[PDB]
């Protein structure tokens, strides 16, 4: 596949959809999902959420030029705001010249929390749970035989205590669960429910919340990009000077939360529209992202920007990225399935990897524009 899509931005929507079809070998039926409005049947919309009275459209676009670990990919995006898809495409174009985006990711591990109140000896109870870890993990893994058969399941437990609470001490067990190609919520919630009685028995507390964490910091995805000064030269500024301007803008984000919130918002302009295009939950991705940004005690930048020893601009993005290829709208929305076809992803973690590449590209594009805009006279 060649994702360069020459002249794409200036073709008609019909021509763009043709050129996509050719590259991919899309079927007639697949292309027809965009012949006309109303690809989401009302019977499916009505089954998705409650109190449905119709549907609401956003534009559906494809960013060009992306390359992930040497392989070109086409990226579908759904959003209302201008400049995003262009910026993504242009920064991907520049990235290609230097090897494109390089990505990696964790296993698809999610936390399930089990909160236990009213224990007199929570610190001791924590060790009683840890002594009985294998029993808890076995129980967690009893029911979902499809998940187990696919190579997922509860791998481990950790237990945390919060001594200092206006509502008494709490103990919080986390099941660590490999959820394969799902986002994970229903999978891990179900496990948390199943193990709760046993935990109660072991600790003598009352179980309260049994619930996933959206701070999915064992489900990380990672992207790298490199840009050379020659690529960043403008009519006004040397590429070297633009690189120094981008580093200055990164440092500003890193120290000032008022800057970091906006900087990170620009990452999410890249990521969220891919989450929407694939029928995935963008509130989960948002929460994970921003809570991770402040894990240090200070709300900072999710990306990093540096200059390497050759003077090249190098950027990273590592962050939680819980997404699915299965579940809910990702399965039932015909255009979420189309999006997955367009992407070519074979695992949820491959989707996550593309997500962070396009977040990284978006932040780069935003920073580049802000760094190179002349001052008025």
346 catalytic per annotation: no
Buried b (16+ CB within 10 A) or exposed e, 175-204: bbbbbbbbbbbebbbbbbebbbebbeebbe
What the block records as the tokens of 58 is 């956003």
From the candidates 81, 138, 236, 248, give the one annotated as an active-site residue.
Answer: 81
Distance separating alpha carbons of residues 116 and 351, to the nearest angstrom: 35
Question: Which one, 76 or 266, has the nearer CB to ligand MEV?
Answer: 266
From the candidates 144, 272, 281, 353, give the one annotated as an active-site residue.
Answer: 281
Question: Which one, 88 or 218, has the nearer CB to ligand NO2?
Answer: 218
- Tokens 């996509």 found at: 20
Q: How far apart are the first and last CA of the chain?
A: 47
Site for ligand MEV in 73-102 (CB under 6 A): 81
Q: Mask of contacts with ligand MEV, 182-221, x by CB under 6 A? A: -----------------------------x----------
Question: Which one, 71 or 143, has the nearer CB to a second copy?
Answer: 143
- For residues 197 and 205, is the Cβ–Cβ distance under 8 A? no
Mapped onto helix, strand or coil, the DSSP state of residue 283 is: helix
Report in angstroms how near the CB of residue 114 gets to a second copy at its nearest: 10
Residue nearest to ligand NO2 according to CB distances in the complex: 104
Question: Which one, 19 or 265, has the nearer CB to ligand MEV?
Answer: 265
What the block records as the tokens of 279 is 């029928």
Site for ligand MEV in 217-276 (CB under 6 A): 262-263, 265-266, 269
Q: Mask of contacts with ligand MEV, 34-73, x by CB under 6 A? A: ----------------------------------------
Q: How far is CA 34 from CA 57, 280, 325, 338, in A?
A: 12, 20, 21, 10
- For residues 109 and 178, is the Cβ–Cβ distance under 8 A? yes
Q: How far is CA 127 from CA 140, 199, 209, in A?
A: 19, 12, 20
18 catalytic per annotation: no
240 catalytic per annotation: no
Interface with ligand MEV by CB under 6 A: which residues?
81, 211, 262-263, 265-266, 269, 366-367
């Amino acid at each position: 596949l060649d994702s360069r899509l020459p002249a794409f931005r200036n073709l008609s929507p019909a021509a763009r959809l043709d050129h996509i079809g050719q590259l991919l070998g899309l079927s007639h039926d697949d292309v027809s999902l965009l012949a006309n409005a109303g690809a989401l049947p009302m019977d499916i919309a009505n089954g998705m959420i409650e109190n449905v009275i119709g549907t609401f459209e956003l534009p559906y676009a494809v960013a060009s030029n992306f390359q992930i670990n040497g392989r070109d990919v086409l990226v579908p995006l759904v959003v209302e705001e201008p400049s995003i898809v262009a910026a993504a495409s242009y920064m991907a174009k520049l990235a290609r010249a230097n090897g494109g985006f390089t990505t990696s990711s964790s296993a698809p591990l999610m936390h399930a929390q089990v909160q236990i109140v009213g224990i007199q000896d929570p610190l001791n109870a924590r060790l009683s749970l840890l002594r009985r870890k294998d029993e808890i993990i076995e129980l967690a893994n009893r029911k979902d035989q499809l998940l187990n058969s696919l190579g997922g399941g509860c791998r481990d437990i950790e237990v945390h205590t919060f001594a200092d609470t206006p509502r008494g001490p709490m103990l919080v067990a986390h099941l660590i669960v490999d959820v394969r190609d799902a986002m994970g919520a229903n999978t891990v919630n179900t496990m948390a429910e199943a193990v709760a009685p046993l935990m109660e028995a072991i600790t003598g507390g009352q179980v309260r919340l049994r619930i996933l964490s959206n701070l999915a910091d064992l489900r990380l995805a990672r992207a790298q990009v490199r840009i050379t000064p020659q690529q960043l030269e403008t009519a006004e500024f040397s590429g070297e000077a633009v690189i120094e301007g981008i580093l200055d803008a990164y440092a500003f984000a890193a120290v000032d939360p008022y800057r970091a919130a906006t900087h990170n918002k620009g990452i999410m302009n890249g990521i969220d529209p891919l989450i929407v295009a694939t029928g995935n939950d963008w509130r989960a991705v948002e929460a994970g992202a921003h809570a991770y940004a402040c894990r240090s005690g200070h709300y900072g930048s999710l990306t990093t920007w540096e200059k390497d020893n050759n003077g090249h601009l190098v950027g990273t993005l590592e962050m939680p990225m819980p997404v699915g290829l299965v579940g809910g709208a990702t399965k039932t929305h015909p255009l979420a399935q189309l999006s997955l076809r367009i992407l070519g992803v074979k695992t949820a973690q491959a989707l996550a990897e593309i997500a962070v590449a396009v977040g990284l590209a978006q932040n780069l594009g935003a920073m580049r524009a802000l760094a190179t805009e002349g001052i008025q006279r």
